[PDB]
Design a protein around this ligand. Structure first.
Ligand SMILES: N=c1c2ncn([C@@H]3O[C@H](COP(=O)(O)OP(=O)(O)OP(=O)(O)O)[C@@H](O)[C@H]3O)c2ncn1[C@@H]1O[C@H](COP(=O)(O)O)[C@@H](O)[C@H]1O
Ligand SMILES: N=c1c2ncn([C@@H]3O[C@H](COP(=O)(O)OP(=O)(O)OP(=O)(O)O)[C@@H](O)[C@H]3O)c2ncn1[C@@H]1O[C@H](COP(=O)(O)O)[C@@H](O)[C@H]1O
Ligand SMILES: [Cl-]
Ligand SMILES: [Zn+2]
Ligand SMILES: [Zn+2]
Ligand SMILES: [Zn+2]
Ligand SMILES: [Zn+2]
Ligand SMILES: [Zn+2]
Lengths: 222, 222
């Protein structure tokens, strides 16, 4: 394949802004809402619409050339792959101006929080077990893991966990579930990444051209 | 606290038959749209409705007491945890009479298939990278991985892969995508599992009672 492959989230919080960024950089495209493959109508570019969780691996494995992903999901999967004894690698091209959030430890509102030591021995529900594990190890706090892919915020009220480690932007979900944010462990935004192995001279020149436009678009949006 | 925790799939192929099995074993509960927890109204049992992928880890980590899960997902996650250097453990209580399927290697219809050696050097898309990795290592065949959580059958058409490793029941999806099943690598059905650490006397007696009914229900179904 001589067409550049770019992976983006098929459906979720990054989808609309990923597509808009590309169009604003002059990548015109044809999208069918329920389909894996979309393509560019004016440039030699294929757009792969996938579950966001898959994007880091597709870049690490060299299946696609570029990807737009939240830093949180990138780092979680990098840590996973390293812990499996692999050597995931990627180039960070740009931190983007959307997808802001923070991965934070949160406790029930009525809870005594003085200190990080207050998490000692607690069951902590999260979709980010590697990120959580690393933070807690680095701070010398022992805990019990509960991995849930969704509905993390309901785990305490369901008595499955004492606390959560979950993504927060506005804080409305925490408040709706009578939880309070006590400690940020990771700050995230969407980023543009590239696979490790060198592209052809033609594909790299196309990436270079796109990157100049990304920069110009972000400057014009301030 | 004191209520037995049973994890089942929130929404997918195992949900209906998991719920039916429990009710037929005399666990009464209402399943409406609870985000995570449903309470038995006649027994001290909580039903946790979760993504099926999370069930093995919830059992390994001791977050819940029982779980109903496909052998394929159990084994995939067991292998992942072992590759991280952990020692995941569980008790198998019963192989159940639903969720039958096979994980198979499949190629485009117009493809020359003589041998397993025909997969040498091919890019293979799958949602079960650990199961695939183990099979291919056992048979001494080198390959390139592509992990996709969904739309696996579309990967060859999207030029992301040369072949797939995916779940098959009726075979209609393979046929719809002009693929043919060439080699079964794993046979699966739903199973009932229990966490490793001993339950309280009360909880174990309740599990024992449920198990007698599971046996009786399956006998009465053929
Ligand atoms: N607030 C966010 C949020 N903000 C930014 N992002 C980023 O958007 C990415 C994609 O999020 P998605 O929910 O679409 O992805 P997914 O839920 O994992 O779904 P799939 O593609 O796997 O099907 C995340 O990995 C983050 O990088 C967020 N992702 C999830 N949330 C959740 O959105 C809800 C609202 O947040 P508040 O404003 O604080 O109440 C809460 O449940 C938050 O946990
Ligand atoms: N046919 C099956 C199938 N049969 C049995 N099972 C079992 O059912 C489990 C749950 O499957 P789901 O699709 O509901 O799981 P999921 O989408 O991963 O669910 P969540 O993560 O959302 O909880 C699988 O892990 C298997 O153990 C199957 N799982 C998936 N399929 C797929 O169903 C489609 C139709 O299959 P054919 O009849 O052969 O055309 C194809 O895409 C198949 O890959
Ligand atoms: Cl079309
Ligand atoms: Zn179209
Ligand atoms: Zn269509
Ligand atoms: Zn996701
Ligand atoms: Zn009801
Ligand atoms: Zn699943």
């Amino acid at each position: 394949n001589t067409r550049l492959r770019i992976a983006i989230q098929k459906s979720g919080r990054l989808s609309k802004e990923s597509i808009e960024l590309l169009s604003e950089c002059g990548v015109k495209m044809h999208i069918h809402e329920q389909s894996l493959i979309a393509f560019s109508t004016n440039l030699p570019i294929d757009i792969l619409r996938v579950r966001d969780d898959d994007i880091p691996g597709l870049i690490f494995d060299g299946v696609v050339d570029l990807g737009i992903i939240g830093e949180n999901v990138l780092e979680e999967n990098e840590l996973e792959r390293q812990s499996l004894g692999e050597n995931p690698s990627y180039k960070l091209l740009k931190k983007l101006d959307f997808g802001y959030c923070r991965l934070s430890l949160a406790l029930p509102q009525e809870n005594k929080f003085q200190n990080l030591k207050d998490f000692e021995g607690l069951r902590i529900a999260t979709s980010y077990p590697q990120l959580l594990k690393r933070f807690m190890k680095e701070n010398g706090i022992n805990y019990k893991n509960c991995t849930l892919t969704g509905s993390v915020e309901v785990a305490p009220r369901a008595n499955l966990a004492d606390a959560i480690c979950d993504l927060v932007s506005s804080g409305a979900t925490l408040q709706a579930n009578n939880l309070k944010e006590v400690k940020v462990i990771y700050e995230s935004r969407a980023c543009l990444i590239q696979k490790e192995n060198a592209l052809s001279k033609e594909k790299q020149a196309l990436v270079d051209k796109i990157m100049l436009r990304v920069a110009g678009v972000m400057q014009a949006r301030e």
